[PDB]
Short mmCIF file of C-alpha atoms and ligand atoms in Angstrom, two decimals:
data_model
loop_
_atom_site.label_atom_id
_atom_site.label_comp_id
_atom_site.label_asym_id
_atom_site.label_seq_id
_atom_site.Cartn_x
_atom_site.Cartn_y
_atom_site.Cartn_z
CA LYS A 1 3.59 14.18 34.12
CA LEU A 2 2.06 12.22 31.12
CA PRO A 3 -1.43 11.43 30.22
CA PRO A 4 -1.96 7.94 32.02
CA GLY A 5 -1.04 5.20 29.82
CA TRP A 6 2.18 6.99 28.70
CA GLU A 7 5.58 5.98 29.76
CA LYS A 8 9.35 7.17 28.69
CA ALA A 9 11.29 4.74 26.79
CA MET A 10 14.76 4.91 25.11
CA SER A 11 15.41 4.10 21.54
CA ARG A 12 17.64 0.96 21.16
CA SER A 13 19.02 2.23 17.90
CA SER A 14 19.58 5.81 18.57
CA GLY A 15 19.47 6.47 22.40
CA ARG A 16 16.89 9.23 22.07
CA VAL A 17 14.09 9.17 24.51
CA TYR A 18 10.63 8.60 23.07
CA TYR A 19 7.18 8.00 24.45
CA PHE A 20 4.99 4.79 24.42
CA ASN A 21 1.42 4.27 25.45
CA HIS A 22 0.55 0.72 26.69
CA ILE A 23 -3.04 1.25 26.22
CA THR A 24 -2.94 2.23 22.38
CA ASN A 25 0.51 0.76 21.84
CA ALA A 26 1.39 4.33 20.17
CA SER A 27 4.75 5.56 20.00
CA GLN A 28 6.28 8.98 19.27
CA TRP A 29 9.22 11.17 19.92
CA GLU A 30 7.24 14.39 21.24
CA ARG A 31 6.19 14.46 24.92
CA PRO A 32 2.48 13.59 24.42
CA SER A 33 -0.16 16.48 24.84
CA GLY A 34 -1.62 16.31 28.35
CA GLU A 35 -13.24 11.27 28.75
CA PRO A 36 -16.18 11.66 26.37
CA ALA A 37 -19.31 9.55 26.37
CA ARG A 38 -18.63 8.54 22.91
CA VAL A 39 -15.83 8.34 20.31
CA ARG A 40 -15.60 7.71 16.67
CA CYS A 41 -13.17 5.44 15.08
CA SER A 42 -11.84 4.05 11.83
CA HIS A 43 -9.75 0.83 11.91
CA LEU A 44 -7.72 -1.38 9.65
CA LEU A 45 -7.99 -5.06 10.78
CA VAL A 46 -5.56 -7.78 9.81
CA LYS A 47 -7.00 -11.13 10.57
CA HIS A 48 -5.04 -14.20 11.36
CA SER A 49 -5.87 -17.87 11.50
CA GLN A 50 -6.78 -17.61 15.29
CA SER A 51 -9.15 -14.85 14.65
CA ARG A 52 -12.68 -15.62 16.02
CA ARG A 53 -14.02 -15.61 12.44
CA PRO A 54 -10.73 -16.47 10.25
CA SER A 55 -12.54 -15.37 7.06
CA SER A 56 -13.24 -12.07 5.43
CA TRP A 57 -14.34 -10.14 2.18
CA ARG A 58 -10.93 -10.33 0.97
CA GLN A 59 -10.26 -14.13 1.84
CA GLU A 60 -12.71 -16.92 2.43
CA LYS A 61 -10.17 -18.80 4.54
CA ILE A 62 -7.70 -16.52 6.58
CA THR A 63 -4.61 -18.59 7.03
CA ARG A 64 -1.90 -16.18 7.81
CA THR A 65 -0.28 -16.51 11.38
CA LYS A 66 -0.40 -13.94 14.15
CA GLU A 67 3.06 -12.95 13.50
CA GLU A 68 2.45 -12.47 9.74
CA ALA A 69 -0.48 -10.18 10.62
CA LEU A 70 1.57 -8.24 12.74
CA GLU A 71 4.26 -7.66 10.19
CA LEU A 72 1.54 -6.59 7.73
CA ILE A 73 0.15 -4.32 10.52
CA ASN A 74 3.51 -2.77 11.16
CA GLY A 75 4.09 -2.28 7.33
CA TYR A 76 0.79 -0.21 7.08
CA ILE A 77 1.74 1.82 10.21
CA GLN A 78 5.01 2.69 8.68
CA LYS A 79 3.48 3.81 5.29
CA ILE A 80 0.70 5.68 7.05
CA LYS A 81 3.43 7.51 9.36
CA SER A 82 5.54 8.33 6.39
CA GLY A 83 2.71 9.77 4.21
CA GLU A 84 3.37 7.07 1.45
CA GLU A 85 -0.11 5.85 2.06
CA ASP A 86 -3.30 7.41 3.49
CA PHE A 87 -4.83 5.35 6.35
CA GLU A 88 -8.13 5.46 4.47
CA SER A 89 -6.44 3.91 1.43
CA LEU A 90 -4.91 1.02 3.07
CA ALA A 91 -8.13 0.35 5.26
CA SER A 92 -10.20 0.22 2.04
CA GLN A 93 -7.87 -2.05 0.21
CA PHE A 94 -6.50 -4.39 3.02
CA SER A 95 -8.65 -4.35 6.03
CA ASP A 96 -10.45 -7.75 6.70
CA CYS A 97 -13.36 -5.86 8.33
CA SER A 98 -16.49 -5.37 6.30
CA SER A 99 -15.93 -1.61 7.37
CA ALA A 100 -13.07 -1.46 4.53
CA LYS A 101 -15.83 -0.48 2.18
CA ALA A 102 -16.31 2.75 4.41
CA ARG A 103 -12.59 3.35 4.72
CA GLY A 104 -12.38 1.80 8.02
CA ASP A 105 -15.14 4.19 9.55
CA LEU A 106 -16.89 2.28 12.47
CA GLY A 107 -18.94 5.30 13.32
CA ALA A 108 -19.44 6.44 17.00
CA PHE A 109 -19.45 4.08 19.87
CA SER A 110 -19.87 4.10 23.78
CA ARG A 111 -17.91 2.00 26.26
CA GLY A 112 -19.16 -1.62 26.49
CA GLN A 113 -20.03 -2.16 22.76
CA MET A 114 -16.54 -2.98 21.43
CA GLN A 115 -14.03 -5.37 22.37
CA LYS A 116 -12.35 -4.30 25.51
CA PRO A 117 -8.81 -3.67 24.03
CA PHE A 118 -10.15 -1.89 21.12
CA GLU A 119 -12.44 0.23 23.35
CA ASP A 120 -9.58 1.21 25.74
CA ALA A 121 -7.25 2.20 23.09
CA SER A 122 -10.00 4.00 21.13
CA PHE A 123 -10.79 6.17 24.41
CA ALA A 124 -7.22 6.70 25.02
CA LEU A 125 -6.45 7.99 21.73
CA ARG A 126 -6.71 11.77 21.32
CA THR A 127 -8.88 13.09 18.53
CA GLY A 128 -6.94 12.60 15.22
CA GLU A 129 -4.37 10.12 16.88
CA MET A 130 -3.57 6.70 15.57
CA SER A 131 -2.85 3.57 17.74
CA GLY A 132 -0.10 1.21 17.43
CA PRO A 133 -1.10 -2.55 16.63
CA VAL A 134 -4.01 -3.33 18.97
CA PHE A 135 -4.91 -7.00 19.62
CA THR A 136 -8.43 -8.29 20.08
CA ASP A 137 -10.21 -11.77 19.44
CA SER A 138 -10.93 -10.47 15.79
CA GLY A 139 -7.21 -10.12 15.03
CA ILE A 140 -4.75 -6.95 14.97
CA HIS A 141 -6.24 -3.47 14.48
CA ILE A 142 -4.67 -0.04 13.54
CA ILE A 143 -7.13 2.31 15.09
CA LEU A 144 -7.72 6.13 14.05
CA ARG A 145 -9.79 8.16 16.31
CA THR A 146 -11.74 10.59 14.09
CA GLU A 147 -14.16 12.11 16.77
C1 M4T B 1 -19.06 -1.47 11.35
C2 M4T B 1 -18.73 -2.91 10.67
O1 M4T B 1 -18.42 -3.82 11.40
N1 M4T B 1 -18.94 -2.91 9.39
C3 M4T B 1 -19.16 -1.88 8.41
C4 M4T B 1 -19.56 -2.51 7.23
C5 M4T B 1 -20.10 -1.51 6.16
C6 M4T B 1 -19.95 -0.23 6.42
N2 M4T B 1 -19.63 0.43 7.57
C7 M4T B 1 -19.20 -0.49 8.69
C1 M4T B 2 -22.73 -3.97 13.79
C2 M4T B 2 -22.12 -4.22 12.47
O1 M4T B 2 -21.42 -5.20 12.11
N1 M4T B 2 -22.32 -3.20 11.58
C3 M4T B 2 -22.54 -2.86 10.33
C4 M4T B 2 -22.87 -3.93 9.51
C5 M4T B 2 -23.14 -3.83 8.33
C6 M4T B 2 -23.04 -2.45 7.78
N2 M4T B 2 -22.57 -1.30 8.33
C7 M4T B 2 -22.49 -1.59 9.67
CL1 CL B 3 -2.40 -8.40 -0.59
#
């Protein structure tokens, strides 16, 4: 039926079916379309006080809660999806990763290099697709598979 990872769901607010991916946390209205040695991704990281290192170039002391970080992530996803903001712009301005300076680009990587939830989401994304919020010990990620 659907590229494994995807399941059907129903909108609580509208009653229309949609599709959700439990590896990427992506959700979308259309039935999804459907692995390489390597993928290339960008990401926007929002850290929180329980992050493995609760500090970043934006903030010496990251004090926001996990819930607050998820609200920020969800806000960025909305603006990216509406076209109000570009992923690259929000990553440059607001990612707590040093990769912010490169518009979030991490370059290419294989399995075994990144944190597992990040890796699994990255490899389950199709080229050009964006994840939903992805949780790791670093914080919460929006992941964009570029290659
Ligand atoms: C890959 C990473 O974690 N950071 C980074 C920093 C600067 C430029 N590109 C990437
Ligand atoms: C492994 C890592 O953190 N990558 C990195 C660091 C600095 C600049 N560019 C990339
Ligand atoms: Cl801010």
